[PDB]
Structure formats: C-alpha cells, structure tokens
Amino acid sequence: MDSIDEQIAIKRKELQSLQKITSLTDGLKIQLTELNEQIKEMGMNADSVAQLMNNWDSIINNISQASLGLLQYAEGDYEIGPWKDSKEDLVPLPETMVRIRVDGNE
Amino acid sequence: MENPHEQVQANILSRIIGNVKRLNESVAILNQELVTINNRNKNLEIMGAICDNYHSSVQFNLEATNNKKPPL
Amino acid sequence: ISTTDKYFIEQRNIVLQEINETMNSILNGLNGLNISLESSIAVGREFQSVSDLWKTLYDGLESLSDEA
Amino acid sequence: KKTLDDLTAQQKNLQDTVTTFETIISELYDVLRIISSEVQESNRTETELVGLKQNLINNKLKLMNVLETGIMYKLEILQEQLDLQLKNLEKLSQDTKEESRLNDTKLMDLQIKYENEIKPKIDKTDIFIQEELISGKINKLNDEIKQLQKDFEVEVKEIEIEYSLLSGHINKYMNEML
Amino acid sequence: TTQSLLKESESLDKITAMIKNVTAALKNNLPVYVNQVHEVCKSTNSILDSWINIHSQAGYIHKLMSDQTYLKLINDRLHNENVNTNDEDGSTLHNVIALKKKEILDLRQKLENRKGE
Amino acid sequence: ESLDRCIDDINRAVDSMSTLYFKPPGIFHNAILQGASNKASIRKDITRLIKDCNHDEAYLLFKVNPEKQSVSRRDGKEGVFDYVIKRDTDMKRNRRLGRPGEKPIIHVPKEVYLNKDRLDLNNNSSSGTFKALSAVFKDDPQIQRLLYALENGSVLMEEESNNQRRKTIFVEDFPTDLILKVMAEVTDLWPLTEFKQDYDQLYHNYEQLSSKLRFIKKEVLLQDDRLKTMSQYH
Amino acid sequence: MEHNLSPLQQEVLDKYKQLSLDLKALDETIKELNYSQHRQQHSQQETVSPDEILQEMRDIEVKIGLVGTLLKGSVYSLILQRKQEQESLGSNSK
Amino acid sequence: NIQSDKLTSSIKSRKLEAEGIFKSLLDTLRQYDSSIQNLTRSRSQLGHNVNDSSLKINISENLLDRDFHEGISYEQLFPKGSGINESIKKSILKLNDEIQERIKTIEKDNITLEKDIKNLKHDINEKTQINEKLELELSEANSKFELSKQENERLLVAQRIEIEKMEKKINDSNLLMKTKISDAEELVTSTELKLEELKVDLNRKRYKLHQQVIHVIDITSKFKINIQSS
Amino acid sequence: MDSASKEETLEKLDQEITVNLQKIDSNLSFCFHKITQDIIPHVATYSEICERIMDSTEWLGTMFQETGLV
Amino acid sequence: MNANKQRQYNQLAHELRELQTNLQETTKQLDIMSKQCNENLVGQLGKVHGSWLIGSYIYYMEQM
Amino acid sequence: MTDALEQSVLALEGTVSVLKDSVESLKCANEPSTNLASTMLQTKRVFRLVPEYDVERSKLDLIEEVEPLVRTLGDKLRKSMGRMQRELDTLQQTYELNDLRLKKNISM
Amino acid sequence: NTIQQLLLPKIRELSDSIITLDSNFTRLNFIHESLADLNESLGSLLYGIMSNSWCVEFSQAPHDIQDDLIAIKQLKSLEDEKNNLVMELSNMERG
C-alpha cells in the first residue's frame, strides 16, 4: 500500500483547516444575527419617524375638510366689524368640526 | 473495494458548494435592494439638509433680534 | 377808484393773502402725507412676492372659482 | 399730341378699371359680412333650433315608450290582476253563500228531526215507561207477586197450624192411653 | 365787470362743490380704509408673533433633545417606571443634581487630601 | 379751461376712491385670531370649532377601526371623509408613479359638498340606504326583488311561464322569514338602541306566535293524516 | 361807512366767505388725518401715521423674513453647499 | 414732352395698382365662392338646397388682359339692374329674411313642442296617480281577499262546529233511545220472568209442604200402629 | 504507540473530517436561511417605511421646489 | 489525493472569494444606509420635525 | 491542495473581520439613534377629526329616511302579525274540527 | 382779473396732489390684498397645526423646561470640571 504517514499528514492538515473553517462559520453566524438585529432596530427607528411624520398628512386632511366653510358662507357674510358699510351675526368660522375617540377607549 | 468515506465527502462537499452558491446569489440580491434604496433615498437627506438649514437659520434670526420669547 | 371800491380792493388783497398762506400750509401737509404714503408703498412692495410664493399652499377662490 | 391722347385714354381706362374693381371689392366685402354675421349666423341658429327640435322629439318618443309599453302596460296588467281578484271574490262570495245555505239547511233539518221526531218519540217512550210499564205492567206484576206470596204464606201457616193440631192430638192420645 | 363777475361766480360755486366732495370723501371713505388696513396688519403681526412663539419653543425643545445625556436619563426613567412607577423620586433631575453635588464634594475632599499628602 | 379740466380730474379721482374696495378678512383669519385673542375668546372658539361627540352616538353611527385608527360610516356610504381621504390616497399613488404634486396642495371638496348640500338647501334613484343594502345582500333575485318591492310597494317581476310578461308581486307575498332577515340586517346597519329594542320585541313576537304557529302547523298535518286514517277506517 | 357795493358783487363777496369757511373745514379734516396725537387725546380712532406706516410696516417686515426669505435662503445655501462638494470632488479628481 | 413723361409715369403707377387691385378682387371672389359654397352646404344640411350659381358672382379673369386703349367699366361686369348692390345683395338679404322667418316658424314649432311636452308630462302624471291608486286597490284587493276568504272560512267552520256538536247530541239521543227502550223491555221481561219463576218456586214449595204433610201423616200412623200393637 | 490503534486514529481523522463537514454544511445553511428569511424582509420593510416617510412630507417638497427650482 | 476532491476545493475557494467580495460590497452599502438612517432620517428630518410638532403642541395646549 | 484550503481560510477570515467591523459600527451609529427614537418621537393618536356636516347628515338620514322606512316597516309588520294571528285562529278552529270529528267517529 | 389767474395754479397743484394720492391708495389696496391672502394661507396652516395638536398626545414632552435647561447647562459645566480634574490627575500620575 501507499506509505500511510503521507495520508495521515494530509488528513491532519485537512482536520486543522476544517476546524478553523467551522469556527469561522460560527463567527459568521453570530455576526449575521447581530446584523439582522441592527437592521431591525433601524427599521424600528424609521417606523417611529413615520409615526412622527403622519401628523403632516393629518393636518392636510383637517385643513381640506374644514375649508368647506368658504363655499358654505356667502359674500354678504364677510363684512364684519370695520367692513360693515354704513347705512352677533356668527363671525365666519370655518366648517364646524367634531372629534371622535379612536384609540379604542370611550 | 474503495474507501467508503470518499463518496460521502464528495456528496457532502457538493452540498456545501450548492448552498454557498445560493449564499452568493442571496447576498447579491441583497446588494441590489440595498443599492436601489440608497438612490431612492437620495431625496431624503436633501429635505433634511434644508430642514436643518431652516431650523438653524430661524434660531440665528432669533438671536439677530431679541424676539425670542422665553420657554414654558 | 371809488372809496367803497378801494376798500373792497384792499379786502380782496388781504383775504387772498390769507388764501395764499393757507394753501402753502395745505400743500406742505399734503406733500408730507403723500411722501409718507409713498414710503409705506415702498416698504410694502416686497410682500407681493412672499404672498405669491406662499399662496401655493391654499388659495381657495383662485382655484375654487376656477371650476365655476 | 397723338401719343398724349392715346396715353390719356389709357389713363382714363385704368382709372375706370381701378374704381370698378374697388367698388366690386367693397360690395363683395359688404355682402360677405352679411352672409357671415347675418345669413350664416342665422343658419347656425336654425341648426341649433332644429337640434332642440330633435331632442324634444326624442324625449317625446321616449315618453310614449314609457307610456304605452311602460305605463299603459302597467295599467293593463294591474287592472287585469284587480279584475282577476274581483271575479275571484265574486266566486268566493258565491261559494260562501252556497256552502252557508247548505250548512244551515243541514243543521235546521237535523234540528227539526230532533225536535219533531226525536223529541216526540222520546216523550212517547217516557209515557210508555211510566204510565204503561211502571205504573201499569210493572206495578201489576208486583201486585200479583205480593198476592201470590200472601196466598203461599197463608197456606204455609195453615199447614203449620195443621202440624200443631196433629201434635196436640198426639199429646192428648198419649194421656188417653192411661 | 359784470361778465367777469358771473364767470368767477360760477368758478367759485363749482369749486365749492368739488371741495365739499373731497372733504366728504376724506371723512367717509379714507378713515375706514386706513382703519381696515391697520387692523389687517395688526392681525398679521399677531399671526407672525404666534409663528415666532412656536418656532422658539421648537428651538428650545431641539436644544434640550440635542443632548445625549438627557436622552439616557429619560430612557432609564422609562425603564424604571416599567420596573416600578410609584418611585418617582428614584428618577428625578433634582435628585440627579443632588447626587452630582455629593460626587463633587467627594472629589474636592479627595483633592484636598491628596494635597495634604 | 385748465381749472375746469383739473376739476373733472379730481372729480374722477374722488369717484375712484369711492369705488375702492378693501378685501375683508376671510375664514381662517377669523378662526385663528379669535381663538388666540382672549382667554374667554379662546375658550369660546375652542368650544365652537371642535365639539366632542357623545361616544355612544359616534359608536352608533360610525365604525371605528383601531388597527388603522380610521373612522367610517356604518352603512358604507361615502362621506366627506371618504372623498378627501380617497383623493389624498390616489394623489399619493400618482406621486409614487413620479407624477408631480398638484397646485394648490390643499383642495376644497367642492363638487361632493355641492351636489348634496345645495340639494339639502333646496329641501339608480334609490337612496343611499337601499343602495348599500343591495350591495350587502347577495345577488339572489328573490331578495333583490323584495327590496325593489318595499322600495316601491310592489316588484314588476317577469313571469316564468312560456308567456313572457311582467306581473306585480307585493311585499306580503315573500315569506315572513325573508322580510325579517331584511329587518335584521337593517338593524345591524343601524345599531341605534331604539331600533334594537324594536327588533328584539318584534322578533320575540315572531318567535312566540309564528314559531308556535309552525309547530301547530306540523302537528295539524300529522293529526289530519290521522283524520284520513280514521276516515278510511270508518 | 356802509359800503354800497353792487348786489351781484355782494353775493360774490358772500361766496368768498363761504369758500373761505369750507377750505378751513377741509384743512381741519386733513389736519385730523395727519393728526399725530391719535388715542393720546380723548379719542379712540387711529390716524394715518407710523402707527400704520413705516414704524408699523417694518415691524411686520422683520418677522416676515422668517417665512418668506429664510425659506428660500435655506435651499439657496443647500445649492451653494452642493456646488461646494462638487468643486471639492473636481479638485480631488484633478 | 414733360406732360408725356408725367402721364406715362402716372399710367405705369395706375397699371401696377390695377394689377394689384385685380389680384385682390380675384382673391375676394374666390373666397366669396368658398363662402357661398359653405353657406349652400349648411342650408342643404337643413334640406334647403340653395342654388350655388344664383348667389355666386362671375368676373372674367381675363378682363384686365385687354389693351388699355379699350375701356373697362362697372357696367361691363354689372350692367344696370344687375349690380351687386342692385340684384345680388338684395337677393341675399331676401334669403336672410327667408332664413329669419324660417327661424321664427321653427321657434314657434319648438314652443308648440314644449307645450305638447308639458301636456305630455301632465297626462303621464295623471295616468301615474291613476296607476298608483289602482295598485292601492290591487293591494287592498289582495288584503280584502285575505280577510274575506278567511272570515268566510271562519263562519263556515263555525257552522260545521255547530253541526257536529248537534249531530253528536242527536247520536247520543239515538243511543239513549235504544238504551232506554232496551232497558225498559229488559226490565219488563225480567219482572215477568221473575213472576213466573216465583210462581214455579212457590208451587213447588207448596207441593213440598204437602208431601211433608203426607210424610208426617204416615209417621203418625206408623207410630200409632206401633203403640197399639205393643 | 500501537498499530491497530494507529489505524484507529486514521479512522478517527476520517471521522472528524466528516463531522466537521457536517457542521460546515449546517452553519452555512443557517446563514443562508438567516439572509433569506430575516435580513431581506427587514430590508423590504425598511423600504416600505422610507417610502411612507418620503411620501408623507412631499407637500413640503413641492413648496420647496416651486420657489427654489431645485 | 482524490483529484475530484481537489476540484471540489477549487470550486469552494472560488465561491468563498466571490462571497468575500460580495460581503465587502454589502458592508459598503450597509454603512451608507446607516449614514442615511442615523444622520438624516432621525438626525435632521426626525429631530427638526419633532421639534416643530412638540413645540406647537406645547404652545397650543398652554392656550387651552 | 493547501493553497486552495488556505485561500478559503483567508477569504472567510476577511469576511468575518469585515462583518465584525460593520456590526460594531452599526451598533455605535444605532445607539444614539435608538435612544432618540425610543423616547420623544413616541406619538399616540387619540382622536380623529370628523366634520359636523356628515354627523348632521347621518342624523337627517336616520330621522327622515331610515325613520320613515322603519315606520312603514313597523306598520306592515303589525299587519303581518295580524295575518299570522288570523291563521292561528283558523288553525285552532281546524283543530277543534279534527279533534271533535275524531272523538265522535271513534265513539261510533 | 388777476384773481382767477392766481386761483388756477393752486387748483392745478391740488389736482396733481389728489390724483397722486389716488394712485398711492390704489397701490395700498393692492398691498392690503396681498397681505390678506398671506394671512389666510398662514392661518390655514396654523389652524391645521392646532387641530392636529388638539387630537394627538405626546407622552414625553417636558413641563418645567426652565429647570431642565438651567440643570443641563449646570451639568455640562460640571462635566467640564470633571474633564479638567481627571486630566490633571492623569498628568500628575504620569509625571
């Protein structure tokens, strides 16, 4: 047969290489887990900023909804106070609006 | 006839290569997504910069004149 | 010239001098008021630009009556 | 001078031609604005009016479609169903009165049998039981029973008296033997 | 002469007409105009003052939140009220400065001891 | 002559100052300024502009959707909320396609409020309630024709016989169970308490009298087969 | 001595007094318009003055820069800064 | 020669002016024929086939080609009684008035159609409340059938209940008749049989007692014989 | 040491080669699953939030570009 | 030693090298992404907009 | 052999080291961002605005459309109860009919 | 006669003064309109802000920002003292 010691040496060197590869792969595993956690918390921060940002959209809808008073009222209603021509009357507020509990608690 | 383990290793090694290839592909796809996001986010910091500038400027204005009212 | 005519002439002279001094005063006051008004227009001229570039948020009649 | 006269003729002909063309042009423009602003505008208004006419005619046709094959068909079918219900309640009342007269005829017939045949025969049975059976045949049977019982009892008592007489005679004969 | 007299007479009466016109305008139309524009500018001043007020409070909040340390303190205060909400005194800013002053007194007595050393 | 021409000039000028019109303050001007004027004024304005709704009333009239934190009408009929939010949503989607923002960014809901509030001021043809109903029931011809009938007294249904013709069918013709189910979905669409008590009263009326009637009906069926049996017997 | 003027002349003279009086009236009205003690005497109105003029309008102007000019200046500074890193990148390349 | 040159220059200027004005006239006539054709097409769209040649104006395009020694005048193209202002213009105003009175007639026809339309909504409305009253009578007829056949059933059932109770009472009456007659006859027969049985029993008892009397007599006789023989 | 035992060691090195390959396979598969099922979905949801962020504040964007011509 | 195994390890080396390059690219992209998130998404938009909103909130609540 | 093995080893080592560095940098960058996102950017929406126009319109619908609908529905339902009550009377009368006929016929 | 010749000029200058005043008030009305629409726009934005703030809650907004602010400057100074003290300590330890 072939001299045994040669294959013995080859097998131990592949052994050492393989154990090092396994260790490096475990390290890769842990780093991947930490990276996914990092990405998750950055996504959470972005979600919080989106929650902080939705207020602008809600403001836009509130203004659009309440703007109906302009064509609700008429031209002759506008001359209040100093603009009354000389020859109590519901000063022209916008479309009156109501609130509703939304958080599920009443 | 033949050392029994060899084929096993072969098969095992084959599997390794396969999944590693998938790893490659997976990672590559990630890059693409990542890359896209960055370009698609190329607007956001712009807005922020202006916003940052705006904030700074107003504070500077609030030191230019003494109209800065005390907090509550 | 008759004595009554002469008296009437001096009366017109005096009253017309009074009109002259009064109109000098009036023109001075009107010029002052007008210069102040020109100054107010000069300072207010800038507001047109900001009003236009901020009307883009909510104009109302500019677009609402556009549909009319 | 001959050239002068010829050229003068040319000039007057040119002037006449120019003024003729100018007046024709002016007339053409005037009658053209007549056609455009008055004749063609009138034709446009006429076309709009006949368009309104066609719209009114189409509305009229649609309203008759709503009328006959719509509303009048609805009136026809509604009246058909109402008339169906009306002959139906006619036959209903007819059947009601026929079965009602059958029912009251049946009841008054059987009541007459109860009161004029059943009741008199009940009374007849009653008087036959009391006057003829109870006060009559049954009572006479009881009376004959009592009379026969009395006859039997007196015969039995006479038989016992004969027994006593014979016993006394035997007792006397007993003493007579002395 | 008479004709000149009639000429000046009509001049004067028409002039009197137009001066009554201008004074009527100056008493009726002009004052309400200036009052209206003045009131509108006053309202504009009020609106802009409100704008400066919200901007000032925003700048104050930005200055306060720009600190990382205050963020840490509010964070573990949240952690604490999750752990126990009753003990407000546990996480306060005045307790923080009191413990800071205690730390500084310990520091200075250490420095004076080392100087004595 | 020059004095006369200056006279007509100043007459024209004074007329001009007569014709000048200064624009009066508008809507949001008044709202914000009175809501920031004085403590009593700010309280009155905060009461006028935003009134809190009765939680019972809001619950009875509106679905509240806590997962999306939204509010909608129970019947599903579109309101100003539906119009404004849907318009904002398809604006967002159009912008996602790279289309630019529109001017002005704030749009008054003109047409939706027009076509309805001028009608109110004056105050396919079925109203919103029946439309939402026909939406909510299935496409069964029986239920839809019952809806048609109670909307206009009787339904013009088409005869199943070979003689294709239209005939009217009235509300009593459909079974009582179907109309009760219609009323049930109606009171589901309007949880208001008066309707709920009306429904449970009426359904308890049905459950006693009509259900006992049905029991008596099956029992008379059996007892009538008994009648036929004894009639055959003698 | 009683001056016996012609009576067209006398009526014209009365025209002079009446014109005089209503010019004094107009002068009074314009003085009121330019009157500077508004609300300083017994009064409650306002007169066209720095109260409505340069004193008033610059007070609005100093604040108006917060919304109008500062907003534009922010993006202008952004553009200038963007040109700044563009020049820096060009210098790095060169 | 000065007059000759001046008049020649004026002739040349008027010549170029004549060519320009003639070109303008030809353009005007061509666009006129276009306008006339358009008007004819528009009128024919309403069925009014206007004769195009009647309104068109004919001008010779070679009129100016003649030498200038020969005169050209308005009467050549438009003699008296046939000028544009004379015949063509007046005819076109007459056509305008014809279209105007057509407009008036069509407006009257439209007003008549509108009146017929309002009368048609009137008839539709009348026939509609007729229809809804008839539907009310049909619903009322269905309901009246309901309660009507129903109360007919009610009274018919009532009469049959009365009939069946009285039939039952008559059945019990007949059973009572048969029972009472049978009981009375049975009682009479039983009393008669009891009388007969009592007659038989008492007669046999009488015979038994007589036989016992005979036995007693025999006993007495035997006792007497025994005593005497002793 | 020994001969039968040195053949035993030979088989031993074979054995830990095999199990080490098994561990390598398992760890790489776990890494692949981590990338495929966790990291990429998180990147996608981050994309969604960034879309919502840039989307909501766009009216500021129009207001800015209408004047600054950016 | 088995030539098949040798080619298997050659393929493994190629795959691991390209994996290293791809991971370095991913590291660059992730670093840039973190820069956008922490410096702009929360650094400027978040901070400034939260400042505006909270300041306006406080201002209006004090005027209840 | 060993060349390819060591090449694989060094490649994996490079990936692991770069991943360690990127993770550490990500943590350092995230810590202040996470701290800021946790506390003051927290926001709760408690109310949603509802124009009073739609509330009054819903009330008007309930009182002038749904209210008349329920009125006619109630009237027609009461006539329905009347009809079922009637058929209860007819059914009990058929019951007395059938029961009495059974009794008399069985009796004879 | 000369009376009317001297009346004419002051009428002329009064006329030019009044017409220039007319022009000035015209531009004043223009500026007033511009300011009114500016007011309406800013008021609409402010009303939107106000309505949104009257329906949202921020659980972590401070209340005594004065005390927080003076405290944070005092703390920042105390950390500055900390840095110089520790630097001196390390310097004397090294030397």
Author numbering:
A (entry chain W): 1 to 87, 115 to 133
B (entry chain Y): 1 to 72
C (entry chain X): 13 to 80
D (entry chain G): 270 to 447
E (entry chain V): 60 to 176
F (entry chain a): 3 to 125, 155 to 265
G (entry chain Z): 1 to 94
H (entry chain F): 434 to 663
Sentences reproduced from the published study:
Cryo-EM density was not visible for the Spc24:Spc25 subunits of Ndc80c. The coiled-coils of Ndc80c emanate from the calponin homology (CH) domains of the Ndc80 and Nuf2 subunits (Ndc80CH and Nuf2CH) at the surface of the microtubule to fold across the outer surface of the Dam1cRing. Following focused classification and flexible refinement, a distinct interruption in the coiled-coil became apparent. Mutation of a series of four conserved interfacial residues on Ndc80 (Ndc80CC-mut1&2) did not impair viability, consistent with in vitro observations that disruption of this interface by phosphorylation of Spc34 at Thr199 exerts a minor reduction in outer kinetochore – microtubule rupture forces. Our molecular models therefore account for two EC-sensitive contacts: the Dam1C-ter-Ndc80cCH and the Spc34-Ndc80:Nuf2CC interfaces. At both, residues phosphorylated in EC would cause electrostatic and steric repulsion, explaining how EC-mediated phosphorylation suppresses kinetochoreDam1c:Ndc80c assembly.
Knl1c functions in the spindle-assembly checkpoint (SAC), whereas Ndc80c, a heterotetramer of Ndc80, Nuf2, Spc24 and Spc25, is the major microtubule-binding component of KMN. Here we describe the cryo-electron microscopy structure of the budding yeast outer kinetochore Ndc80 and Dam1 ring complexes assembled onto microtubules.
